[PDB]
């Protein structure tokens, strides 16, 4: 009849031979929306249309890294804080009040 036929072409290329014509080769380059130099969110609506299974794992990697860094540093320095409460019961005063203002 008369029909539209969607195809898909990556970086490596594609040819099509319609009837008794000669083959017509076509290579496809990137025009993903956004901008790799604009600082906001549009820097990763670009790298999602190009290689989508890599951007999600690298974003989850850095989000897991920042949460584990914040949690591990907070827990370890809180343990190191509680390992320095040798003056208790307040019957003498605190040793360095500037250090207690830093800590408490």
């Amino acid at each position: 009849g008369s029909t539209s036929r969607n195809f898909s072409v990556g970086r490596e290329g594609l040819e099509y031979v319609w009837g008794n014509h000669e083959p017509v080769r076509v290579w496809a380059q990137e025009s993903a929306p956004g901008d790799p130099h604009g600082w906001p969110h549009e820097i990763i609506i670009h790298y999602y249309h190009r290689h989508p299974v890599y951007t999600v794992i690298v974003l989850c990697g850095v989000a897991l890294a920042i949460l584990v860094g914040t949690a591990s540093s907070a827990a370890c320095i809180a343990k190191a804080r509680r390992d320095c409460l040798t003056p208790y019961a307040l019957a003498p005063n605190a040793t360095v009040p500037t250090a207690l203002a830093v800590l408490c």
């Binding site: 072409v9 970086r11 290329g13 040819e15 031979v17 017509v24 080769r25 076509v26 290579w27 496809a28 380059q29 990137e30 025009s31 993903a32 901008d35 790799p36 130099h37 604009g38 600082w39 820097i43 990763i44 670009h46 790298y47 690298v58 850095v62 890294a65 920042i66 584990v68 860094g69 914040t70 591990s72 540093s73 370890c76 320095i77 343990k79 190191a80 390992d83 320095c84 040798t86």
Partner: protein
């Protein structure tokens, strides 16, 4: 002097490289592959086509018996019958009231148009590649052609060249391949000796004019019912034609890597895969030395615009203050920027506009005029025409595919996390070793 490099294997696009020695001037070296055929070593087994059942005029023996022999022609089938009484036009062709016998034999052989319409069944293995490439050294050119195993040089006028072995050695063919009328297929035909009735490989011959052919297509005879004389027979459908109906698309348009497959030497021209290593020697007649070469001073490149595409998108201007005038090589020492202008003509206070093409989202590479380097940053934009009829001259390298800012965000975002872990560890150690001594 000897210089070795590893070009990509895509027919058509060059690979820019330099050579340099102690006390000598640099020299440009672009080489490209213009034809690359992949021919395998074939071995023919048999030649087959559509058959033609030949039935001779049936014997009849009157008031007697008749038993039949064994013959060597293809699919010979005999059968005798007791008590027939045949009529030709003048009736009663036998003087024997229902005690006579007849013979009925049939066999099979080639049709008279199989000298054009025959399929050939081959068996291919160990495809070895050959390259026609174009060496350009020191404003001189040379055309040559070499085998690509790493031991066989093919020279051209004092220019030796060792093509090392290709990384991914393969062929587009299987172990078994069949050809009719210039169309290669990719089929699994039966061995010469195992005939299946009503499938491909039905007639067999080592050559199409041979005498001792082999067939098995179940000629079975039937008892003559009617009084007129003829020989009833049935036969399976021709396996060559009911293959030819279901042949599928040929391997001229289903083979990978852009291979164009011809038939008459059974080659596979212009396949695009892998990398090849090349080791050439350059004669000393082209290596000009630095005592007479035009040396260079005060170079500072800068960019004006950059797209990253397959066409030459970027364009950079350049300043240079040479003391003398001549021809100095221009090159970029990256692997993501290929530079179009191979050579230039320098003057005292002039300026050169160049062209390049990239795939990295930004350009941080160094260009080189006549011996010494120069650096210049850029900022490249995505293009709009996202289908073009020209292949990419570069690769991506998968680390420079991120810009400065997209690299910079995530690297700062977990550098801060690692640094706060380090400072928590050191304040932990400091407080612990302060208190445990008490």
């Amino acid at each position: 002097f000897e210089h070795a490099t590893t070009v990509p294997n895509v027919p058509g696009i060059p690979y820019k490289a330099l050579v340099e020695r102690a006390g000598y001037a640099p020299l440009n070296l672009e080489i490209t592959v213009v034809s690359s055929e992949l021919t395998p070593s074939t071995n023919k087994e048999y030649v087959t086509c559509k058959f033609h059942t030949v039935i001779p005029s049936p014997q009849v023996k009157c008031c007697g018996s008749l038993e039949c022999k064994a013959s060597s022609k293809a699919d010979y089938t005999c059968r005798v019958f007791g008590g027939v009484y045949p009529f030709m036009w003048g009736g009663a062709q036998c003087f024997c009231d229902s005690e006579n016998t007849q013979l009925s034999e049939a066999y099979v052989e080639f049709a008279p148009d199989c000298t054009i319409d025959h399929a050939v069944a081959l068996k291919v293995h160990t495809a070895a590649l050959k390259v026609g490439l174009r060496i350009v050294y020191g404003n001189t050119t040379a055309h040559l052609d070499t085998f690509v195993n790493g031991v066989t040089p093919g020279s051209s006028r004092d220019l030796k060249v060792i093509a090392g072995p290709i990384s991914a050695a393969f062929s587009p063919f299987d172990h078994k391949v069949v050809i009719r009328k210039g169309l290669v297929y990719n089929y699994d035909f039966p061995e010469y000796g195992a005939m299946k009735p009503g499938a491909f490989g039905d007639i067999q011959a080592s050559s199409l004019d041979a005498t001792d052919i082999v067939a098995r297509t179940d000629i079975r005879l039937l008892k003559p019912s009617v009084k007129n004389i003829h020989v009833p027979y049935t036969q399976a459908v021709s396996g060559y034609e009911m293959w030819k109906n279901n042949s599928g698309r040929p391997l001229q348009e289903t083979a990978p890597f852009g291979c164009k497959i011809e038939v008459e030497p059974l080659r596979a021209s212009n396949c695009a895969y892998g990398h090849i290593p090349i080791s050439i020697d350059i004669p000393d007649a082209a290596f000009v030395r630095s005592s007479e070469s035009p040396t260079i001073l005060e170079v500072s490149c800068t960019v004006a615009d950059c797209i990253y595409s397959a066409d030459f998108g970027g364009s950079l201007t350049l300043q240079y203050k040479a003391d003398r005038e001549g021809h100095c090589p221009v090159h970029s020492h990256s692997t993501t920027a290929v530079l179009k202008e191979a050579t230039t003509h320098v003057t005292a206070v002039g300026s050169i506009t160049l062209h390049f093409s990239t795939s990295s989202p930004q350009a941080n590479f160094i260009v080189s005029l006549c011996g010494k380097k120069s650096t210049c940053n850029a900022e490249c934009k995505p293009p709009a025409d996202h289908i073009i009829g020209e292949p990419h001259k570069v690769d991506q390298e998968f680390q420079a595919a991120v810009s400065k800012t997209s690299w910079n965000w995530l690297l700062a975002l977990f550098g801060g996390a690692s640094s706060l872990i380090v400072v928590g560890l050191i304040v932990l150690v400091c407080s612990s070793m302060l208190i445990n001594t008490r």
